[PDB]
Design a binder for this molecule. Structure first.
Ligand SMILES: CC(=O)N[C@H]1[C@H](O[C@H]2[C@@H](O)[C@H](O)[C@@H](CO)O[C@H]2O)O[C@H](CO)[C@@H](O)[C@@H]1O
Ligand SMILES: [Ca+2]
Length: 139
């Protein structure tokens, strides 16, 4: 199955990283960010798919309840890659000021997309730590 990949600098504050692949929306992880409690544009969390599989969709749940429920990116992108070096943006997002809590980013790909790595990436500095809950693909 797909394995988790994320910005190496993050530190787990509460929960576990395996909670992001257990299929339960109500289990997640709270990551401490460095750089003065700031997630820089360009930081990321996603999946290494193993080989070049063709995807029909993704379902990513960001944020979580209680602790760090408001600790989410404002601006981010969904991007994919073949080599973990060059990336292609599928879609950008701006959810500045949206309510704290879980948020299910769910995308279906009209034309299937050929990828080895698929992730969410920050596009604007934010003075916050980060919560997430689940990451899944659809083929
Ligand atoms: C656990 C928590 O409160 N996390 C905060 C985080 O807090 C830092 C620090 O800024 C703060 O003064 C103390 C107070 O206990 O806790 C630390 O752990 O601050 C960041 C940035 O504001 C929040 O995103 C995060 O939720
Ligand atoms: Ca989960």
């Amino acid at each position: 199955n797909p394995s988790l990949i994320r910005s190496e600098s993050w530190q787990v504050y509460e929960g576990n990283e395996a909670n992001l692949l257990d299929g339960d929306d109500n289990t997640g992880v709270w990551y401490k960010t460095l750089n003065g409690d700031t997630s820089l544009a360009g930081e990321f969390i996603g999946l290494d798919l193993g080989k070049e599989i063709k995807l029909d969709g993704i379902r990513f749940v960001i944020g979580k309840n209680g602790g760090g429920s408001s600790d989410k990116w404002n601006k981010f992108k969904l991007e994919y890659s073949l080599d973990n070096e060059s990336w292609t943006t599928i879609k950008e997002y701006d959810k500045t000021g949206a309510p704290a809590g879980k948020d299910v980013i769910e995308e279906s790909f009209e034309t299937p997309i050929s990828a080895k790595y698929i992730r969410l990436t920050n596009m604007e500095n934010i003075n916050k730590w980060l919560t997430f809950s689940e990451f899944a693909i659809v083929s």
